[PDB]
Design a protein around this nucleic acid. Structure first.
Ligand SMILES: Cc1cn([C@H]2C[C@H](O)[C@@H](COP(=O)(O)OP(=O)(O)OP(=O)(O)O)O2)c(=O)[nH]c1=O
Ligand SMILES: [Ca+2]
Ligand SMILES: [Ca+2]
Ligand SMILES: [Ca+2]
Ligand SMILES: [Mg+2]
Length: 341
DNA sequence: GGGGGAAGGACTC
DNA sequence: TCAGTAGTCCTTCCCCC
């Protein structure tokens, strides 16, 4: 199997730069303003100019402004990024039927039936980068290897605006020299647990007692890491089918007053249904983000599709369940639909 | 024992 | 004073042949 992974460079910010060339060269920060107070919210992403001084995804907008008060701050316009993204994904389908869109700015192409070796794979990669640049003037990074995981690792190493191939030999090398925290799917929580086991490289997972590893990071993650260590990971590239559609919004102020939360909850339901398009969900979850930012969720699965009317009444039941089972104040409220017919 | 599922939370991105 | 809201897994409790 030969896999080619594509990840668009500093996507949200780059799109803004394509739509407004004068931004090129200046630090640009795409922001998610929450409305609670002046500059309240988080950074969605920033271009490399801004990222260079510590302004990156996730940090508070207020903090970004302390670091680069003169950077250009733009409100996130996800709809616009989504449409640009959709066009680029369509350019990708031309290179392979087997494509897995993993997020708004990345996808995997199984080009096994398209090239014969990495040399050709590399060229196809350059071809794809030129194509996207020509059509949308967007730079992306390509990663190529024997499976999805290493194709992604390949791209992470070559970004931004790059291209890299990790041949069979380098895969074996990485299984020994690569920091395990840099393996896709390993976050801070898991990385830390692994360090507490003396595990810092994929190969190390092979010298520990399975159940000990398992008992520490879960059966799935343990098996995942082990299969990679054994150079046995080979998950197929498959069409992604969205499994849930929802909306969660921050309220002007925290509260646990039903009548005061409802409007938001109902707004969330309205937007979610629009997104559902023609999909009919059999499950609904009311999601609350408490004042301390903990997440409390209560849902229900019905034997038949949920009409928007049922969604209204049922969501109110779930919200109250949360209210009676959690005394904290609610900061954000939303709904999430799944199990589509 | 294990197929099968619903529900709430953990972890990742 | 930290947005948003998807996709696995894991746990528990639980029905049932
Ligand atoms: C990470 C992260 C990304 N995003 C959005 C912003 C990004 O443009 C997009 C893709 O995430 P990356 O993870 O691919 O963000 P980036 O495109 O700016 O990437 P790079 O370092 O590869 O050049 O999704 C968030 O909104 N919040 C986040 O916490
Ligand atoms: Ca990405
Ligand atoms: Ca990217
Ligand atoms: Ca990591
Ligand atoms: Mg909690």
């Amino acid at each position: 199997m030969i896999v080619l992974f594509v990840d668009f460079d500093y996507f949200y910010a780059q799109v803004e730069e394509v739509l407004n060339p004068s931004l090129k060269g200046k630090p640009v920060v795409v922001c998610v303003f929450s409305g609670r107070f002046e500059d309240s919210g988080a950074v969605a992403t920033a271009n490399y100019e801004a990222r260079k001084f510590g302004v990156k995804a996730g940090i508070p907008i207020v903090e970004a402004k302390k670091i680069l008060p003169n950077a250009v701050y733009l409100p996130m316009r996800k709809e616009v990024y989504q449409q640009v993204s959709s066009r680029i994904m369509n350019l990708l389908r031309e290179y392979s039927e087997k494509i897995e869109i993993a997020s708004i700015d990345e996808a995997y192409l199984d080009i096994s039936d398209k090239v014969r070796d990495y040399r050709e794979a590399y060229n196809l990669g350059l071809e794809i980068k030129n194509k996207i640049l020509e059509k949308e003037k967007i730079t992306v990074t390509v990663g190529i290897s024997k499976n999805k995981v290493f194709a992604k690792i390949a791209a992470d190493m070559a970004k931004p605006n790059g291209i890299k191939v990790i041949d069979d030999e380098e895969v074996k090398r990485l299984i020994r020299e690569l920091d395990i925290a840099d393996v896709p799917g390993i976050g801070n929580i898991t990385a830390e647990k692994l360090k507490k086991l003396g595990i810092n490289k994929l190969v190390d997972t092979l010298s520990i007692e399975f159940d000990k590893l398992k008992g520490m990071i879960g059966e799935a993650k343990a098996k995942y890491l082990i299969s990679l260590a054994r150079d046995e990971y080979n998950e197929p590239i498959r069409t992604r089918v969205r499994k849930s559609i929802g909306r969660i919004v921050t309220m002007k102020r925290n509260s646990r007053n039903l009548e005061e939360i409802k409007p938001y909850l109902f707004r969330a339901i309205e937007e979610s249904y629009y997104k559902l398009d023609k999909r009919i969900p059999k499950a609904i979850h009311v999601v609350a983000v408490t004042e301390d930012l903990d997440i409390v969720s209560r849902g229900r699965t019905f034997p038949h599709g949920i009409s928007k009317e049922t969604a209204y009444s049922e969501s109110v039941k779930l919200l109250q369940k949360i209210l009676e089972e959690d005394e904290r104040k609610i900061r954000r409220i939303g709904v999430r639909f799944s199990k589509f017919i």
